[model samples]
Target: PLESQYQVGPLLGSGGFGSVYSGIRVSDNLPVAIKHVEKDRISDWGELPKGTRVPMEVVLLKKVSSGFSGVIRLLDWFERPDSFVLILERPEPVQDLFDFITERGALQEELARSFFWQVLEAVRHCHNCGVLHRDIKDENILIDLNRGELKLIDFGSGALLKDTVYTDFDGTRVYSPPEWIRYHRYHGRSAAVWSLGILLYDMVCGDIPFEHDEEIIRGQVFFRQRVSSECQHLIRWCLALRPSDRPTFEEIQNHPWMQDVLLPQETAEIHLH
Candidate 1:
C-alpha cells in the first residue's frame, strides 16, 4: 500500500543527502516532491545538543510554518532500509530565484521590493521562533512567478537558533560574511543579516559585489545601477562590518523603503515538529 500510493517521477535534483524526485499522491492527486537521503550518509541523527532528538531542519520548518506560510510545507515522510523520504509541497509553475536572475539581467527595484519583503517577513517569524536558516541564497529561494510568491527551501544547513553563536556553518562562501570566514564563529542573527544583504545586492545589482575572500574581508561594495537612496541604506545596514551593527529583522522590515509599498498579511503558523 505504501508503494502503491505514490508515483515517483523523474529526478529533479540531488545533493549530499541524495536525490529529489517528482511524486504524486494517487488518492488526492496532489503534486509532491520526494527527497531521498541515505541513512549511512547521514552525519547527524537529527539530534540537537539538548537531550531531545529531532531533525533541526524539521523542527525549524514546523515552528516557522506555524506562524508563517511563506516556507515550503512538509507533507509526509517515511523511513526506508537505506534512506528517508521526505514528502514536500512542490508548488507548480515556480521558478528558482537563480533562474529568474538569469532571465532578467537584474531585478528591478520594484520586483525586488515585492519578493524581498515577503522573504523578510518569513525570516523574522523564523527568528522569533528560534529557528535559523543559515543558508539563504538565490538558489534556495523559489518564486511563484504567477502570484509573485516566494518560498525558502533546503534546510540541510538550518539549525536551532543559538542566543550567542553557532560554529557548524554550512553555507555557500558567496553568501557567507567576513566573521565566519575570519573567526570560524559568529552570532546567528548577524550571519543571517549578512546573507540577506548579499541576496539583496544580487537582486538589484544582478551580481555579487565580492568574489574573493579578501573582497569579503574588505567589505567594500560597488553598485552599477542607480538604485534609490533607501535601498542603498538598507544594504549598508545589513552588510555592516561589525556584527553588532547589523540591523535586526524587525528593523530591516520596517526600513523606510516600505513606506510606499503595502506588504501582505502575516502567514499561517502551524507547529508540525
Candidate 2:
C-alpha cells in the first residue's frame, strides 16, 4: 500500500524517472504534487543523502524548503522496495508556465516583468543557498493564474555548487548559454543568466530566442514583436555572450526595469476545487 497519510490520485505528468500525481493529505484533505520514482528509471545519480536512498531531487527540495517564496517546498517523502514517492506542495489554480504560454501565446510586457523579477528572486535564493538549479525552464515553473505566484520545481537537474569546474551540459541545452553551447561547460553564474534571458524572452515572445547551437553561439537576438527598450536591454544584459558581462542574480534583481514595480502580493491556496 502507498503512504497512509496521502490519498494518491490520478497521474499529473511523467518523464524518464517516473510519474507525478495529484494527491491529498488525510489530515486536512490537503492537495499535493506527488512524484513516483521507479527503481530502474533512476539515472546515474552518483550518491544519496546520508541514511536516505532518495535522489538529488528529494535532497534539493528539502534544502529549498519553505523559506524561499518562489521555490516549491517538500511536504514529505516515502521509500518502497520498488519506488519512492515525494509529496510536494500543490498551488491553487496553478498550471505549468509552459501551459500558460500555450494558452495565452505571448504575454504582456508588464505581466512578464512581474514573473521575471520573481524568478530572479528565486534564482538569487537558490544561488545564495549554494544550489544550482541547472534546468531553469518553463516546464519547471508553475504559475498561479489569479495571484501570479511563481513556483520553481524539478530539482532533478540541480547540484550543490562546488569550487571545481562543471564540464558537461548537464541541463537542457535549449536554455543553455552561448558559452555552454560552444564550450559544453557550465560557466557557473553565466549559465543561469543566459537561461533567464531565454526564459524572459519566452515569457514575452512565447518562443525560445534561438533554435540552434550555431544561432546561440552567434549571439544574435531578434524579437517577434516590439518590446520596450528597457525590456530589450535587460534581456541583452542577461544573455550577454561573455560570461563576465552577464549580471549576477543579485544584479538582475536590482536592475532598473525590475525595480519600477512594487513587489506583488503573496498568495497561496490549495488546488482541490
Candidate 3:
C-alpha cells in the first residue's frame, strides 16, 4: 500500500534518526519528504486512528491542525517490521535558517523581526493546541527566501504540553535552559522561551550566545554584532536565568521588538497556490 500511490525519489539526507528522501504522491505529484526511521530509536509511542501505536513524532504531527503554515504537515505514514515511514510536506525554494543565516552572516533587524514574529505565532499555536515543540533552533526552522516565510520542522522532540516538570532533556544541549542543564528538570513553556531566545540571538548575532554548560548556567549573552536595543531587551527577557522570570507567549507576542511586524496571512493561506 505504501508504494502504491506515493513514489519515493532521490535521497535528501541522513541524520542520527534515519535517512530522508524526496518523494511524491503519484495521484497529484505533491512533493513530500520520506523519512525511514528505525523502530529501535523510537522510545515514545502514540496511538493511531485504529488504536495502533506509532512513533511520538508522527503522533505530534497528527495532533496539530493543517491551518498553520509554520508547522509542517504529515501527509501519511506506514509501519514496517523493522522501521517506520513518514511522508512530510516538502516546501521548495527553502533552506534551513542555520544555512540561511550562515551565508548572510546575520539578518538585519527588520528581516529578523518578521521571521521572529512568525516563529512566535507558530510556537503559540503549538502551545494552544497542547503541544510543546521541545526543540526549536535555527536548524529546525526553514526559511523560504523567495517569500520571506518561515516554517518550523522536526517535531521529533515534541511532547504533550504539561505543567509538571520534565526530567528528560532530549533537545540540543546549547539550546537547553539553565534549569534543565543544572537541575535536570524543566517545565515546558519556560524551557521553550529559553530556546526561543537562543534562536533569536543566533538569527541576529550570527552565532549562538552560549557554547558550553558553564556559559549557559552563567547566563551571560554577549552580542558581538550590533543589534537594536529593543531586540536585545527581548532576547534577554526570553533568556532569563530564572525559569519563573521568562515571559509567557502573550508577553512575547506583545514585546516591543515583535510588536511592529503584522502577522502574515501567508501563515494561514499559503497552501492555496
Candidate 4:
C-alpha cells in the first residue's frame, strides 16, 4: 500500500456510503476533509449496468462543483483498486442546521430568509446547469458561521437531466414530493421545489407539517388548512401534485413571500416549544 502523503487525523463524521476524516495536506499544511469509501460497500443497484462505485459520486461532484460558489470545494481524488479517497474543503467549527435548530428552536425570520434565499440561489444554479440535486435537506446544507456563508454538500444522489425520467427512490422520504410516492418517476426540478418548501416551513415553524403516513400527508396537502397564508401560498406553489402546477426555482425566488417586505423577518423565526 502507498503511504498517505497527508497526515490523517481523527474521524470527523460518517455518512451513508463512507467516513470523513480530518487531514492536513502535506504540500500546503491546509486542513482538509478526506472521504474514504470502502471497496466492499460498492454494489450494483441496477441503476448503472456496471453496478455502484465511487466513480459516479466523483463524476457528479466534479460536475456540480464547476464555477459554483458556496458549494463544497472538491480539491482532489485518489483512486485505487480497493478504495477511493476524496479531498474536500474543511470548514472550521462548522455544525449542521439540525443541531442549530434543536438548540435555538426554529430560526428567526431574517436568518431563515437569508438561508432560504441562499439555498434557492444554489439550487437555481444547479438546475440551470442541467444538474439535479435529488437529495436536498437540512443535513446537506453546511453553515460556515465565521464566513457567514452556506455550503451545499453531498452529491451522491445528484443526476444530470436527460430526456428520460429517473425512477430511483432516493433522498429523505419526509421531504420527498407526493409524485415520488404516487409514481416512482420524479419530476426533478418540481420535486426539489416541494422539498425546499418543506425545508422553509421547518425553518420557520420548527416542526414538520405532515405526518409520515401517506394519507395524512395527502390530507395536509389537499384538505388541511394549516400554515400561515403567505407560507400556505408558497407551499402550495411548491407542493402542487402536478409538476406543471408547481413554480420553477426561478419563480420561487421572485415569489411574493420572498419579495414582500410586509412580513416581519422575526416572525419567520418562531421558537419551537
- Best candidate per lDDT, number? 3
State the lDDT of candidate 3 residue by residue for 182-220, as single tens digits. 999999999999999999999899999998899999998
Per-candidate TM-score against the hidden true structure? 0.89, 0.91, 0.94, 0.83
Q: Residue 36 in candidate 2 has what lDDT?
A: 85
Per-residue lDDT of 9 in model 1: 92
* CA error at residue 111 for candidate 4, angstroms: 0.9
C-alpha lDDT values of all predictions: 0.77, 0.79, 0.85, 0.69
In candidate 3, which residue ranges exceed 4 Å CA deviation? 262-273
TM-score of 1: 0.89
Better of 1 and 4 by lDDT: 1
Best by TM-score: 3
Provide the lDDT at 239 for model 2. Answer: 86
Question: If the candidates were sorted by their lDDT against the true structure, best first, what order would they fall in?
Answer: 3, 2, 1, 4
Candidate 2 has its poorest 10 consecutive residues by lDDT at 264-273
- Tell me the lDDT of model 2 at 172: 83
* Candidate 4, pairs of clashing residues: 107-269, 108-269, 109-269
RMSD of 1: 5.1
The runs of at least 3 residues in candidate 2 whose Cα sits more than 4 Å from the true structure, single-residue gaps closed, are 44-51, 266-273
